[PDB]
Write a protein that holds these residues in place. Structure first.
Motif, PDB file in Angstrom:
ATOM      1  N   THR A  82       0.883  -0.938   0.247  1.00 37.08           N
ATOM      2  CA  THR A  82      -0.062  -0.290  -0.163  1.00 37.08           C
ATOM      3  C   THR A  82       0.729   1.480   0.288  1.00 37.08           C
ATOM      4  OG1 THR A  82      -1.905  -1.109   1.622  1.00 37.08           O
ATOM      5  CG2 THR A  82      -1.768   1.555   1.453  1.00 37.08           C
ATOM      6  N   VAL A  86      -1.034   6.745  -1.194  1.00 36.93           N
ATOM      7  CA  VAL A  86      -2.855   6.016  -0.886  1.00 36.93           C
ATOM      8  C   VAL A  86      -2.439   5.906   0.987  1.00 36.93           C
ATOM      9  CG1 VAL A  86      -3.839   4.108  -0.570  1.00 36.93           C
ATOM     10  CG2 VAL A  86      -2.657   4.784  -3.096  1.00 36.93           C
ATOM     11  N   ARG A  89      -3.705   9.583   2.164  1.00 41.31           N
ATOM     12  CA  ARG A  89      -5.316  10.066   1.260  1.00 41.31           C
ATOM     13  C   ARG A  89      -6.009   8.876   2.417  1.00 41.31           C
ATOM     14  NH1 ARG A  89      -7.773   6.153  -2.343  1.00 41.31           N
ATOM     15  NH2 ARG A  89      -6.545   6.400  -4.129  1.00 41.31           N
ATOM     16  N   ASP A 121     -11.500   0.756  -4.290  1.00 38.27           N
ATOM     17  CA  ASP A 121     -10.446   1.527  -4.692  1.00 38.27           C
ATOM     18  C   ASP A 121      -9.865   2.054  -3.310  1.00 38.27           C
ATOM     19  OD1 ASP A 121     -10.970   1.615  -7.381  1.00 38.27           O
ATOM     20  OD2 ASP A 121     -12.904   2.212  -6.885  1.00 38.27           O
ATOM     21  N   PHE A 122      -9.403   1.257  -2.475  1.00 41.85           N
ATOM     22  CA  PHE A 122      -8.601   2.150  -1.667  1.00 41.85           C
ATOM     23  C   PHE A 122      -9.128   3.471  -0.452  1.00 41.85           C
ATOM     24  CE2 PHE A 122      -6.283  -1.780  -3.460  1.00 41.85           C
ATOM     25  CZ  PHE A 122      -6.194  -2.481  -2.642  1.00 41.85           C
ATOM     26  N   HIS A 123     -10.608   3.848  -0.970  1.00 38.15           N
ATOM     27  CA  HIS A 123     -11.966   4.903  -0.109  1.00 38.15           C
ATOM     28  C   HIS A 123     -12.253   4.076   0.881  1.00 38.15           C
ATOM     29  CE1 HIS A 123     -10.504   8.035  -2.903  1.00 38.15           C
ATOM     30  NE2 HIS A 123     -11.638   6.596  -4.057  1.00 38.15           N
ATOM     31  N   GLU A 247       0.344  14.041  -2.161  1.00 45.38           N
ATOM     32  CA  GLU A 247      -0.659  13.878  -3.486  1.00 45.38           C
ATOM     33  C   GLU A 247       0.201  13.595  -5.014  1.00 45.38           C
ATOM     34  OE1 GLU A 247      -3.992  16.505  -4.861  1.00 45.38           O
ATOM     35  OE2 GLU A 247      -5.164  14.639  -4.528  1.00 45.38           O
TER      36      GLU A 247
END
Ligand code: RCM
Ligand code: NA
Length: 247
Positions: A82, A86, A89, A121-123, A247
């Motif tokens: 990961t 990310v 985020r 989506d790893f949100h 980002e």
């Protein structure tokens, strides 16, 4: 308002709605119903939503949106990497979710990686699978993420700062890819140690973690609650940092 569902609509526990699809279900009246209506107001992209309630005879259930990749610790420990942007985020989203919750006057009380769910989506979305934020529904665990003022004091009232401490430990876990305190002798002594200032071993973060996130986590797990920032304060700092370096 709030959607009363029946169990004939279906075929924590996964549940399959006949018209809506995949949902998750925690199986457990004006008062329970009212509480559920209050919780139904929590509507935000970073917050697991209460979709419905099942109130029938021999079973009471809360019905929430499904998150496809499970909890955050599960994803952190996955064989697949990961990336740093990310993780940054994910931190930002956790911050947004918590700010929204406190903004609605909701204090989580039990924030931790298990209560951080992750989609394909790893949100992420914040959850409360143990119903810590509830009063009537909870009536009918590990303390790694619990603020010291709550350790050995079950009567003190939890504040927004409590959740900020939990957030601190979650930052740590996000960068170490595991639970803190693996070297602990036993829970009693561990509790006294944390109450006296012991914190997750930063040296046990082996992969790269920016120095300012280490700073943030140290600020957020300060012993004095008033020395911890609020979530809007955290965002105020972290968002322009995230954009400008991550980002
Ligand atoms: C327990 N169940 C959830 O995980 N999400 C919904 C809404 C909800 C109630 N309290 C919450 C906290 Cl503290 C965080 C996120 C969602 C909630 C819910 O009722
Ligand atoms: Na222990």
């Amino acid at each position: 308002n709030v959607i009363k569902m029946k169990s004939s609509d279906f075929l924590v526990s996964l549940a399959f709605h006949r018209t809506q699809g995949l949902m998750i279900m925690k199986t457990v009246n004006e008062a329970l119903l009212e509480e559920a209506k209050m919780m139904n107001r929590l509507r935000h992209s970073r917050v697991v939503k209460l979709l419905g309630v099942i109130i029938e005879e021999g079973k009471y259930s809360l019905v929430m949106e499904y998150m496809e990749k499970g909890n955050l610790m599960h994803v952190l420990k996955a064989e697949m990497s990961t990336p740093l942007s990310v993780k940054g985020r994910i931190i930002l989203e956790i911050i947004e979710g918590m700010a929204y919750l406190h903004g609605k006057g909701v204090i989580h009380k039990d924030l931790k990686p298990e209560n951080i769910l992750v989609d394909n989506d790893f949100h992420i979305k914040i959850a409360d699978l143990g119903l810590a934020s509830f009063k009537m529904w909870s009536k009918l665990g590990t303390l790694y993420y619990m603020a010291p003022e709550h350790l050995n004091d079950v009567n003190a009232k939890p504040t927004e700062k409590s959740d900020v401490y939990s957030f601190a430990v979650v930052l740590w876990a996000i960068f170490a890819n595991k639970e803190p305190y693996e070297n602990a002798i036993a829970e009693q002594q561990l509790i006294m140690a944390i109450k006296s200032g012991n914190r997750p071993d930063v040296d046990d973060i082996t992969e790269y973690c920016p120095r300012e996130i280490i700073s943030l986590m140290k600020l957020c797990w300060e012993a004095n609650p008033e020395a911890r920032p609020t979530f809007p304060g955290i965002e105020e700092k972290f968002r322009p940092f995230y954009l400008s370096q991550l980002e």
